Amino acid sequence: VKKRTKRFTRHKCELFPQLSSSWRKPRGEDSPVRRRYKGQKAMPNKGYGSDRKTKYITPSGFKNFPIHNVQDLYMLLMQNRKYAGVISHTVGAKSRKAIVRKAHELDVRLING
Amino acid sequence: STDLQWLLVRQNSKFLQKRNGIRLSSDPFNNNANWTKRHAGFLNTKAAVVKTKGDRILVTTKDGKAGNKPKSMYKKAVMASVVSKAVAAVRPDLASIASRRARKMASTLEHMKKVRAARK
Amino acid sequence: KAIAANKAARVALKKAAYARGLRYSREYRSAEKKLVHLRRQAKSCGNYYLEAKPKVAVVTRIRGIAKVAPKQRKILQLLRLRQIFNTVFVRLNKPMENMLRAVEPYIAYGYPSLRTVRMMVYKRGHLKINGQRVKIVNNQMIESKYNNENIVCAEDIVNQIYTGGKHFREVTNGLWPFKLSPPAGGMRQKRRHFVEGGDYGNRDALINRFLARMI
Amino acid sequence: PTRFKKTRHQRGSTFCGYGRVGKHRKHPSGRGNAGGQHHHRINFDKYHPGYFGKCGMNHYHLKKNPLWKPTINLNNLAKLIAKDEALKAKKGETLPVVDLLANGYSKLLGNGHLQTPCIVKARWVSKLADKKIRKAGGAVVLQA
Amino acid sequence: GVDLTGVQKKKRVVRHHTYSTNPYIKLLIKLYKFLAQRTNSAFNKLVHQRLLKSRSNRAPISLSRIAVCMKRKSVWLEKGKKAPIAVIVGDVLDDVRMARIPALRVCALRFSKSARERITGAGGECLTFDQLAMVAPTGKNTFLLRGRKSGRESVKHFGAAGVPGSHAKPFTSNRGKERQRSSARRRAFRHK
Amino acid sequence: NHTNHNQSRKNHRNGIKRALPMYLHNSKRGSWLPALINARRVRKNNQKAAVKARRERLAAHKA
Amino acid sequence: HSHGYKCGTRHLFAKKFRKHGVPSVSTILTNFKVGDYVDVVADSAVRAGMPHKYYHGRTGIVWNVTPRGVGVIVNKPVRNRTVRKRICVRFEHVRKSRCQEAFKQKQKDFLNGGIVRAKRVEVLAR
Amino acid sequence: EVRRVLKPQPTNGFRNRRLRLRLNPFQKKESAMVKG
RNA sequence: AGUAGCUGGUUCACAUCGAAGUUUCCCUCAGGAUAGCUGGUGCUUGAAAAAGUAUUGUGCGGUAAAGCUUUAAAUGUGCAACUUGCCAAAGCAAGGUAUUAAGGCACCAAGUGGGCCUUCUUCGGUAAGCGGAGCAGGCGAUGCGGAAUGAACCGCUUAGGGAUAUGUGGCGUCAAAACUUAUGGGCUCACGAACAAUGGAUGACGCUCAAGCCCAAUUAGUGCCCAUUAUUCCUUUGGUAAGGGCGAGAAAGUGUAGCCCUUCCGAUGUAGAUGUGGCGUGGAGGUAAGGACGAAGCUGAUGGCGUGAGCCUCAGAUGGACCAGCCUCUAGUGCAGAUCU
RNA sequence: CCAAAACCAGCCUCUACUGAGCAAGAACGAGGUCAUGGUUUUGGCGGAAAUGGGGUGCCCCCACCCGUCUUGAAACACGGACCAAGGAGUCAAACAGACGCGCAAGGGAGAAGAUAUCAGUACUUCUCUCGUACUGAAAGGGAGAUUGUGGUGUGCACACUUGCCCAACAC
Ligand SMILES: [Mg+2]
Ligand SMILES: [Mg+2]
Ligand SMILES: [Mg+2]
Ligand SMILES: [Mg+2]
Ligand SMILES: [Mg+2]
Ligand SMILES: [Mg+2]
Ligand SMILES: [Mg+2]
Ligand SMILES: [Mg+2]
Ligand SMILES: [Mg+2]
Ligand SMILES: [Mg+2]
Ligand SMILES: [Mg+2]
Ligand SMILES: [Mg+2]
Ligand SMILES: [Mg+2]
Ligand SMILES: [Mg+2]
Ligand SMILES: [Mg+2]
Ligand SMILES: [Mg+2]
Ligand SMILES: [Mg+2]
Ligand SMILES: [Mg+2]
Ligand SMILES: [Mg+2]
Ligand SMILES: [Mg+2]
Ligand SMILES: [Mg+2]
Ligand SMILES: [Mg+2]
Ligand SMILES: [Mg+2]
Secondary structure, three states: OOOOOOOOOOOOOOOOOOOOOOOOOOOOOOOOOOOOOOOOOOOOOHHHOOOOOOOOEOOOOOEEEEEOOHHHHHHOOOOOOOEEEEEOOOOOHHHHHHHHHHHHHOOOEEOOO | OHHHHHHHHOOOOOOEEEEOOEEEEOOOOOOOOEOOOOOOOOOOOOEEOOOEEOOEEEOOEEOHHHOOOHHHHOEOOEOOHHHHHHHOOOOOOOHHHHHHHHHHHHHHHHHHHHHHHHOO | OHHHHHHHHHHHHHHHHHHHHHHHHHHHHHHHHHHHHHHHHHHHOOOEEOOOOOOOEEEEEOOOOOOOOHHHHHHHHHOOOOOOOEEEEEOOOHHHHHHHOOOHHHEEEOOOOHHHHHHHHHHHOEEEEOOEEEEOOOHHHHHHHOOOOOOOOHHHHHHHHHHOOOOHHHHHOOEOOEEOOOOOOOOOOOOOEHHHOOOEEEOHHHHHHHHHHHO | OHHHOOOOOOOOOOOOOOOOOOOOOOOOOOOOOOOOOOOOHHHHHHHOOOOOOOOOOOOOOOOOOOOOOOEOOHHHHHHOOOOOOOOOOOOOOOOOEEEOOOOOOOEOOOOOOOOOOOEEEEOOOOHHHHHHHHHOOOOOEEOO | OOOOOOOHHHOOOOOOOOOOOOHHHHHHHHHHHHHHHHOOOHHHHHHHHHOOOOOOOOOOEEHHHHHHHHHHHHOOOOOOOOOOEEEEEEEEEOOOOOOOOOOOOEEEEEEOHHHHHHHHHOOOOEEOHHHHHHHOOOOOOEOOEOOOOOOOOOHHHOOOOOOOOOOOOOOOOOOOOOOOOOOOOOOOOOOO | OOOOOOHHHHHOOOOOEOOOOOOOOOOOOOOOHHHHHHHHHHHHHHHHHHHHHHHHHHHHHOO | OOOOOOOOOOOOOOOOOOOOOOOOHHHHOOOOOOOOEEEEOOOOOOOOOOOOOOOOOEEEEEEEEOOOEEEEEEEEEOOOEEEEEEEOOEHHHOEEOOOOHHHHHHHHHOOOOOEEOOOOOOOOOO | OOHHHOOOOOOOOOOOHHHHHHHOOOHHHHHHHHOO
16 A cells, blocks of 8 residues: 555646656755645655555565566576566567466466466 | 675676566575575585476485585485475475475476366 | 573562552652641641642643754753653752743643652653663563662652652653643643743643643 | 766756855866965965975085985894894804895984894994994994 | 754764675674674674774784784783784784794784784784684684874874974975975964 | 854854863973973983883782 | 954953052962962953953963963863963962862762741731 | 674553553552542 | 856756855955865764753853942853972972763865844934844745745744644634634724725625623633644654564675564755665676567557656557666766757 | 454543642543454455556645746746757866775886787886985984883773773873
8 A cells, every 4th residue: 555656747747748757856946846835746755665565566466577588487486476477578479478388387477478 | 615605696696686676596406596695505515406307396405525516516316394304404494495395396296287287 | 491580570570569659659648648737737726837849840841942042942952851742850959940940931840740740651651771762561671771779660760750759860861751742622822921821831730730631 | 987976976966066156167266376375375374384485505406316325224124134044143143244235225224123133234324323233243334 | 843953963973884895804794793793792892893994994003013012911911821812903014123023823804924924933823813703702812903093194194284283294295395494384382 | 244143053063162171282381491391300200110110010920 | 443452451451449459468479389270360450461351250270380470271262162272371360269169178078848837927918 | 612602562551451550560459449 | 169256057866964154364345265064984982071051169240220430230251069399408399109961083075155034132324124233043945834915923843644632823704613602701883803196905705792802711600623743653764773583584684675573763954965786878898688479769548666766567550670687897878948059 | 345343452532638619539431443453253246346557527625937146036037939869077187085905114017028829918127116214405414122012191802800001192
């Protein structure tokens, strides 16, 4: 159960198409956001850190671990209830056939099988 | 010594798999792929592993006696606390995990026979 | 061996805490019956009784930490009144009565009742331990803090911070200053003196009411 | 390494540590040591007190080779004597001999407590070195 | 909502981990971190913290200065008491000014090739912190020492020279450049 | 402009450091000299008897 | 705009009313061993060796006695530090302290409320 | 050689009954006194 | 590519701390240097030389008041807790056998060196939202809650949240609360509710046995509402904080996906300083791996992860051939703003 | 998965004196609560359901355009139409402190050479350079104590029940 589910967006990203939504800390004395007036956007801080034993845990309940080939699956053989292999985006559909019928045989989870 | 070696390979090695900030070992001889000195058996003077070998559980072992002769430094032995009885024969502390891997190696072997047979 | 010697001690300590607080209960019931006889003697004698002066005030910081002057700001630190509704027991030396007089607009205080002392020490009581602020929970906790054959019970503490103690400093200093909640039902005016119809300053025995809503 | 500069840390913090006010200019004072006698006067006088002035006789065309008189103390003659050769050196017996020009030293200052005798062989000697060296039963022999 | 005035000023700056890249310091900190925690000994707590210091703050010691400080220590020892081990958390350097030294038993991170040979020429052992832990797991008659750092030429520069009390050394490539007439100079001495 | 505002605040940040203890920089030097010179004659004699005392303690300790 | 050595001493170095005149014999026969506490209360009748002004009324230990003068170490708050000053002073300007006279008395000696039976008792009303 | 040298729930204490009875063992002997 | 003490700009995140507008000096006054303030690094050891506070003892003072230029406050302020001279001489001298709180020291270095307001005290000025000082506090650099509104007033100062309770301020509507409470007192008929000209301001309405004023109150001669505050709970982060421990895990560990657990205290912040097994870019030494079963790139109600910079996955009914990871090296490395090109 | 109830714990709320009053103390009883902990129970939902995210709208509420110099910016102060690419603490050198590494009373090379195989790596002579000694304008001179800390004061650790004191400061 996350502290904040919203992104901490950059101030006024919505007005300027070029600005990425990605966070930049506001600066300028007069910044409404760094002066942290109440009606303004929030800034990220240590206090929004997620609970630390639920951290990094995907709703499946697994921590994702990158996988590239069939050998990686054995890195997850003994901790298959803790880690879930997420096959890399660029492995071929060829190789993924091999990772997948083997990630099945081993009882290891895969996020994108 | 291993205290020194581990402090050498610890920040990087072929086996460390620091992916997504998670750190698992690609090490053949580690039992739970946790990048830890207790487990980094490729590094340890003594080591034990309980990998499968075609339906059979396999329990590769590495007493230190071989020393540094990689061709014969590791000694396999095919074969449920009995496998742990073998692994503790070389590494006593590894045994509690070596048992639990040795089980999970069995449920995997049972699980895949169910899966390999179902793939028909 | 030690495992059971921990029992011989934990059993011996409540045997002591029983023995202690049996004395303190008697030392209260007796001390006050004796203090009733005299004021009652005197009324028969057509005669007044000058009650012994308070030897302990339960000072309570009552204004917040903003805009406070360097002299008041130091006296509050030496009282260990560093937050708002912090509380400490300070005994009423002339030198203290002159510290309290220097920061009264920042504090409410008076002369705690034995009950007020119990509630703070039992409910809000926290020992300093290895610099840790440690909630009182065991008499074991107290004897370890206070390596003092005198101070073992939580009843030892309440007597010290009420009777005025010979260890009133040894005791009250080993307590973290009390972190009271704001008085339920509110204050009156943290700006006026109590006799002005406000809040700050000495309010004598009445502090027990004010401080009761807080504890 | 560019990675490590705090140039790289303060990428994003607009004034790179130079301040919003009091802006990072160019030469807010002069180039180099300008105003050493003016607006940086408090600075040289505090730190480089002797910096301004003239102090002594000139030596036109100084030649340092003629002036070359490097020194080794009695207390340091073990640096030259072989530890093996130096092993037994009674004052009344045979002594290691130590040419100092060979070893690059010219004068022989008579510092600490020499106690192992040696026949030091050097261009110059201190008043106290030849004395100490004799009292140890050794002997400087003058060379050039 | 708290007075904090004067709290931050009381914060201390201490090293809690070595900056040394050297693997052996880290096996050596691995030991005495352990040994300092698992023993009640104050010696392990000193060897452990000094071991965490800068090589600046781990100044080297002359073997000359060990032989002095050691015999000066050991000379009083009641007969049949063997002399303390001479531990230093730093290098031990040979001293030409003391040709003959006592059979010392020095223990240090590092020894000069000269110190190590003179140390063994006297028959003394030149042991490391490894077997220091194995012989004196506690600082039992160890004699922990430090090398000097006041005579270090960096500190000769501390302060100003121009300030009257001071005898700081001015920074100068040119020794004759900031030379000055006796008249113009700062007063040498000055009471604090 | 010459306001002394924020100065005692800025001064009490690192406190008014209290003055050095009398046992430290207790140099004489500019002390009335004739006393100062006789003091050297005594202190130098304290040194010869301090050293002479330690020479005694060692010879005493060879027993 | 004009701070010479005795700026603003119109009252400070004034003799008290009907207490004018140079220091007496009780002054002159006071003696100062070093490390004695003293009060640098400047006396105007004596002008040689007069303390600056800051040092008026300050206490400090003697660190030095010359034939007519008493060196005194007197702390001065300069800024964030108390610099420890060494004023030189003619002995008239130094009144020996009693600042420790209580404490010396101590190691010299180291060597509630009840019924009030009072009967007079006027009413307090206006 | 090295092993040898090695060194070898209630909040409110005033109103909670068991907590107070623990801090102040005599309290129940005192509460019995309270009846009447 | 003249120079510019001037103007403008100076690109990732997070965490840790965090100012100054004053001193001396300068052809100095829009700038330096200097010291202070601040950071970092330590060092040193742990009621060391602790204290913006009293008490007690001992000095200092000449302002208000007084007085007719003199007595004298309060607030203050200091302080304390054998050998070798002198003497006439061996005796003197000198050196020797209350509360609270970790103390001191060093190094390097920044920003700053336009301040402003207010409190009280003043000085100058006819007066000022005026010039000048002293004191302290503030704003600057800081919100939040309140005064309708307000840089500095009031309260309170600030990690992400919940309960509780408050502070200043309120409780007729706006507006949470007296569904217009009192089983309180007076006063009031026309206005009334801290710091001459666009029509229009107790904030608005409206209120008048008040919804005004003074006073007191709290269910009544038998209270309630609202804070970034307090307390408590959960979580985070920091601690160069305190301990314990060493079905899957149990690493001797600064720092990671932190070796694990426990407890405690802290958390704002401009300039600035620092940290970061912090992010990210082009390249290199390595390692490991991927790709025509589709690399990079690009698109994206593709979700997922991370406080965040960001990463990852999904999908392209995109592309067409290169390339991510990890440790080390490197830099022409991160952009809404320069009347930028 | 949504619910609801229970239990336990926690937590919270809701006599005495006095001359009818208080400055006054508990008790019994009951309630509340999981955005408190542990104990399930019971039902509801189950090509879909369910929780989460995302999107769009609304509702109530909060909310002054940013950057900027400035005591003070929402300012009737400056810059600001959009987007893409680019764009600004760099390189050298001389010092310094700090930190890492190497050796250490020495350290280091440079130019160059010689070799083996590739502007690299390996190798080395001779020197030079910084340092171990300072001072004086200069001629010049040039530092141990009474087999060893020059003394003394304060001083880790260890030792022994005070010693030695490392460093370090001071004298
Ligand atoms: Mg109120
Ligand atoms: Mg006020
Ligand atoms: Mg900043
Ligand atoms: Mg800077
Ligand atoms: Mg500048
Ligand atoms: Mg300026
Ligand atoms: Mg010249
Ligand atoms: Mg030296
Ligand atoms: Mg100015
Ligand atoms: Mg006067
Ligand atoms: Mg600018
Ligand atoms: Mg802060
Ligand atoms: Mg300007
Ligand atoms: Mg007058
Ligand atoms: Mg008057
Ligand atoms: Mg408001
Ligand atoms: Mg309403
Ligand atoms: Mg912060
Ligand atoms: Mg490039
Ligand atoms: Mg879109
Ligand atoms: Mg660029
Ligand atoms: Mg302006
Ligand atoms: Mg030198």
